[PDB]
Amino acid sequence: PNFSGNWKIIRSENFEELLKVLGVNVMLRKIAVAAASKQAVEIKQEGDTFYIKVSTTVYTTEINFKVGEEFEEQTVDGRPCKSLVKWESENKMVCEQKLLKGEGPKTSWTKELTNDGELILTMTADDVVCTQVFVRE
Ligand SMILES: *C/C=C(C)/C=C/C=C(C)/C=C/C1=C(C)CCCC1(C)C
């Protein structure tokens, strides 16, 4: 099954609460929530190799990984981490993150392709889960 495509966000829930856990002050949280409403995700999937480009109006980032192989990226609030993605089912994967330096909330993310053709991303910090839903452009 295939995540490849150009995805545009239709719903973003609990993102402010996630950023709050991660220590972001209120004005930056509000501006970040607004930036998230413009989020686009481009995915190229080849077997278990993924190329992902996530962008908003003024920023773009590339995430490249192979399932089961450690890689480096950043947490949501922007701290370098070591990440490891595993499948949880046919169309859902889970990424566990570990800070390269220092300490903080336990963070992770998941990506799921639903039977109805939506892409669901969750991002977690401790007890707080943000859910974002995308459809194909
Ligand atoms: C498989 C898809 C993944 C791993 C998507 C990750 C997306 C992010 C880490 C998005 C982060 C953003 C911020 C930290 C604030 C600016 C707006 C976002 C939503 C692009």
| Residues ending a continuous segment of the chain before a break (C–N > 2.5 Å) | none
Residue range of the domain that includes 131: 1-137
CATH number at residue 28: 2.40.128.20
Give the CA angle between residues 48, 53, 54 to the nearest 5°: 120
- Hey, whose CA ends up nearest to atom 4 of ligand 1? 109
Structure token pair of residue 20 = 């709050």
How many structural domains compose the chain? Answer: 1
From 10, 17, 18, 54, give the residue whose CB has the most ligand 1 atoms within 8 Å, as the site to mutate: 54
CA of 101 to the centre of ligand 1 (A): 21
Give one DSSP letter per residue of the chain, joined into a string. Answer: ----EEEEEEEEESHHHHHHHTT--HHHHHHHHHHHTT-EEEEEEETTEEEEEEE-SS-EEEEEEETTS-EEEE-TTS-EEEEEEEEEETTEEEEEEEESSS----EEEEEEE-TTS-EEEEEEETTEEEEEEEEE-
Technique of determination: X-ray
Residue 108's nearest CA partner among 93, 91, 90, 89 is 93
| Total Cβ atoms within 10 A of residue 60 | 11
Q: Give the C-alpha separation, 80 to 96, whole Å.
A: 13
- How far is it, in rounded angstroms, from Cα 85 to Cα 97? 9
Atom 18 in ligand 1: residue holding the nearest Cα: 36
Give bridge partners of residue 136 from the DSSP assignment.
7
- Stated in angstroms to one decimal place, the resolution of this structure is 1.8
Q: For residues 116 and 4, what is the distance between their CA atoms, to the nearest angstrom?
A: 15
